[PDB]
Amino acid sequence: MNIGSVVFQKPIPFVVQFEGDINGKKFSVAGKGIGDANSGKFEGKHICTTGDLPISWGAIACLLMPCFAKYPNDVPDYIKSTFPEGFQRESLVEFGNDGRYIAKQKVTLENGIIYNRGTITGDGFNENGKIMRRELQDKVAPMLTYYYPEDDGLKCIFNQLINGNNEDFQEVKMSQKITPLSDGPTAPRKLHYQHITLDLRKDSSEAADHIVITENAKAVSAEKYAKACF
Ligand SMILES: [Cl-]
Ligand SMILES: [Cl-]
Ligand SMILES: [Cl-]
């Protein structure tokens, strides 16, 4: 029995706070939403409080809470087991023929609200590229992500494809490391996958530069994934 399973048994509001600096361009994002780990759906609206986001929203979409993923019982939920204290995650995000950035974030539970507080720092992006000129669509293709133990944390590796405006795609390569914020007991770290679909949309009434992320994440054991029907 893992304690985190009880806190996420009902939908929980969440708050996202990000500070960024990519190619010397500083930005700040503030968002809020709701996550339901019973369904694996969590949806939030995020606004760039410093003006316009210097990069395509899709490039930071899945950094703006894998604790909300729907985990079956035949998969040990390590991420939820780190609660109530929470977890931290470091990410190396590399874009094909463009730059890279590093993010560090801490996902905590405070007064019954999930807080995703993170920081992004990157450089080497093409100033005439579709990322920094924001010519990519706000559309991200479906994903499968790999989870597996490494050292004393849970490592996650996966790719992302952001649609371009001319039948092209932008490659996103991510390498993440999840570790607990406390030295308390956690669930087993075992190989498994997450099936994620993102839908980025805009609010007509919102004047600020923003994005509305509808995410549906489900965990799959390696035995059930191998026996999959599509
Ligand atoms: Cl941080
Ligand atoms: Cl870097
Ligand atoms: Cl570790």
Side-chain angles (χ1 to χ4, degrees), residues 1-8 11-222 224-230:
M1 288 328 190
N2 132 46
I3 289 86
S5 60
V6 167
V7 324
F8 294 103
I12 306 172
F14 66 77
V15 171
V16 185
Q17 303 177 358
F18 262 76
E19 301 298 321
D21 181 332
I22 283 168
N23 273 24
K25 303 180 186 197
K26 296 185 167 182
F27 60 93
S28 312
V29 181
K32 68 180 76 183
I34 290 173
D36 186 7
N38 294 319
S39 55
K41 184 180 176 178
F42 49 116
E43 195 184 283
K45 178 164 156 204
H46 314 267
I47 66 165
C48 178
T49 66
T50 59
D52 283 9
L53 198 70
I55 52 166
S56 284
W57 280 102
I60 63 169
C62 232
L63 277 69
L64 300 171
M65 292 152 298
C67 45
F68 288 123
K70 181 181 172 248
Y71 268 73
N73 296 104
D74 71 324
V75 179
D77 200 340
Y78 171 80
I79 299 174
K80 281 191 191 60
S81 78
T82 68
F83 284 87
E85 303 97 327
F87 69 93
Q88 70 195 133
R89 189 179 66 178
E90 318 187 342
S91 323
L92 171 60
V93 182
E94 304 178 61
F95 299 85
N97 304 284
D98 230 272
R100 72 233 177 273
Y101 70 71
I102 289 161
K104 306 189 188 164
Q105 67 203 104
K106 298 185 168 156
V107 180
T108 54
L109 175 80
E110 301 170 22
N111 306 301
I113 302 153
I114 298 290
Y115 281 86
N116 179 22
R117 299 198 184 85
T119 8
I120 288 166
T121 183
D123 62 350
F125 287 81
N126 189 344
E127 285 290 352
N128 314 297
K130 298 201 175 177
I131 300 170
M132 305 269 335
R133 287 171 62 187
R134 299 185 59 178
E135 299 175 342
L136 299 174
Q137 294 182 28
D138 296 321
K139 199 192 186 188
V140 180
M143 305 145 56
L144 189 81
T145 72
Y146 297 19
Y147 284 89
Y148 63 101
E150 193 203 55
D151 301 329
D152 305 323
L154 192 68
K155 187 136 178 273
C156 175
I157 61 179
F158 64 94
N159 307 312
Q160 252 180 335
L161 293 170
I162 312 171
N163 294 59
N165 57 337
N166 192 68
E167 318 202 21
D168 56 313
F169 292 87
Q170 174 60 65
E171 317 100 273
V172 191
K173 168 191 186 174
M174 302 216 183
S175 191
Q176 296 165 330
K177 180 64 139 53
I178 300 171
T179 54
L181 290 170
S182 88
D183 59 332
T186 54
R189 290 143 39 218
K190 297 297 192 183
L191 168 72
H192 66 279
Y193 308 85
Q194 274 198 29
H195 174 281
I196 296 146
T197 70
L198 296 136
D199 171 50
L200 317 186
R201 17 165 289 200
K202 300 269 187 180
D203 188 3
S204 322
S205 69
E206 181 55 63
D209 189 22
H210 70 285
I211 202 67
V212 180
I213 311 186
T214 307
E215 185 165 333
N216 278 94
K218 295 173 183 182
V220 194
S221 66
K224 294 213 181 186
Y225 175 80
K227 295 187 176 178
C229 287
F230 298 102

